[PDB]
Design a protein around this ligand. Structure first.
Ligand SMILES: [Zn+2]
Ligand SMILES: [Zn+2]
Ligand SMILES: [Zn+2]
Ligand SMILES: [Zn+2]
Ligand SMILES: [Zn+2]
Ligand SMILES: [Zn+2]
Ligand SMILES: [Zn+2]
Ligand SMILES: [Zn+2]
Ligand SMILES: [Zn+2]
Lengths: 235, 235, 236
């Protein structure tokens, strides 16, 4: 179940401990068929240089049968919904996640957090919002889910950095959910058991979970304007 | 012999070249049953962010049968025996090694060094003093061995950064020795054949070498205040 | 063919993604018998600390039958041909590559770039000039190739960082060496020099002046430049 994991971090931050090759190896063993590396965007503390993201265009697409997406976990910078990902960085990347992390955007009033998150969602630049359920950052969950559904952004169901409320808001707003391990070692790759239970409780519809198959996720990215990746044709 | 290595460094410093996964693979190959990663403390040049240590809490305890300890090689900060390890770092770690490294504590007058080391030993915060037999830092030795025995701190017998003196001296003072490779690649993991023969030179008592077994070392840590690690119970 | 690759980068830069062990494993799989790690010199952005280079002296020489050279891709710093490699770094390293990279030396007038590159060559401190064919740094290719032959420096035949026929033909006539280098930033492209090869043959480049044909040829070149012989490689 869910042979896709979309959110993890490499030694590019010292607070992560696994490399691209560790992740490929763990994917192969666990039967994960498609994954994305999404290192923290460069404005954060302990994050890689922006070249880290631009040079991901060099990576192989398929290794040991495992498909590899080039991603970022960009940081929401302001209430205008700007993130620390440049045009050149976008050009090299397949997957844009964005979230709140305190060095870049300190938690503020509910209206502030909400406006920034919705402005990021409305920018058309991001595919997934990471850990929107984080109690550190209070938000209007319903207003966020409705914007995410309108602009076709997935909300993550997801340490160093509200399961039911988000899952139920997405359920009713009609949006996508993305499962992500936020792995900082390859050992938790693809492990998102903690929420699966809640999703079943709130009767979240299986059809709106991106992680169900490589093709469902790739189709979603293509619906968002991504050119088809020919190497993933047999996934 | 000595299936425990307690002092090694990962790519969290650019002057080291191996990852957690490299150390695991090597441990498996060399029959090492328990090991600790002890990356340089954050005040040192070319050392990781403090989050590198806090986030070690996420690591698996046992991989491929090998136990994994979360450590630091802290740098002695000042004559008050302070080290560059915060309380939040402590909370995340099992093993606290500390030692003199030039960028942080420029070697000074004997008395400065000693006030400093014997005071680190006396802080109760430290488990092992790394390469105390290093000529770049002169210290009252017989005396350091006597404080180490008094305070239950092991002295390492041990590039970029006297064996007999320490070995004979710890022998007579009644304290513990800890063997540590100070590996900066996984290739030298578990290799301390150099000082060892100087140990059989002073007829060092077999029962005061921590590395003889995982349980011996783990009981030592527990005696120093560490809660028992449930996953190592069968080690 | 070309069981030697001399130019590649590890996670010591975040714009690279592979470790020493990843390169070892790939060399074995690809039949590479000798390779060098040549991380970006410390003056560049996103480059390691200088200790990254000094401490390479601890590396094993041969792992699983593959020989490992300790290198640097140093940055040309100025028109005096200085590079960001210290005496203590030189003492730890086997192989010295140097090249232009934006943050350290900005592309300037053809004569500036030329003077800087030739002075580096003429320093005697360098074995190989990396991607001299880079269109971002206009040079007098003939004057460079002639300096390189005089001072026994190899020119590389060669995204982020990022004339191939013009370099090879200049080296051909000047009578110098060429070195092949993948400039890998993951181990997946290790030993991969397909692109320029057809053009080397197109210009009748003499194969006897390609360093990479065998480990011994490359090692003999380094010894010729003053490197004490590496005992552990005696059988390569
Ligand atoms: Zn993180
Ligand atoms: Zn995050
Ligand atoms: Zn994350
Ligand atoms: Zn070190
Ligand atoms: Zn040390
Ligand atoms: Zn150390
Ligand atoms: Zn590079
Ligand atoms: Zn270069
Ligand atoms: Zn390079």
């Amino acid at each position: 179940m869910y042979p896709v994991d979309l959110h993890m971090h490499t030694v590019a931050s010292t607070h992560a401990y696994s490399t691209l090759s560790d992740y490929i190896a763990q994917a192969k063993q666990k039967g994960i068929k498609l994954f994305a590396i999404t290192d923290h965007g460069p404005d954060m503390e302990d994050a890689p240089h922006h070249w880290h993201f631009i040079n991901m265009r060099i990576w192989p697409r398929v290794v040991d049968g495992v498909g590899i997406l080039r991603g970022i976990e960009a940081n929401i910078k302001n209430v205008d919904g700007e993130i620390d990902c440049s045009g050149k960085m976008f050009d090299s990347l397949d997957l844009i996640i964005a979230g709140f992390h305190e060095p870049v955007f300190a938690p503020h009033d509910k209206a502030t957090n909400t406006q920034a998150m919705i402005a990021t969602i409305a920018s058309g630049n991001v595919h997934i919002i990471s850990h929107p359920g984080n109690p550190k950052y209070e938000i209007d969950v319903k207003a966020v889910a409705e914007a995410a559904a309108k602009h076709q952004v997935a909300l993550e169901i997801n340490f160093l950095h509200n399961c039911r409320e988000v899952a139920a808001a997405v359920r009713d707003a009609g949006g996508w959910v993305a499962l992500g391990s936020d792995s900082h070692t390859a050992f938790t790759m693809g492990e998102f058991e903690e929420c699966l239970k809640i999703l079943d409780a709130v009767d979240f519809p299986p059809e709106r979970i991106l992680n169900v198959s490589p093709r469902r996720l790739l189709n979603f990215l293509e619906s968002r304007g991504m050119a088809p990746i020919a190497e993933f044709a047999d996934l």
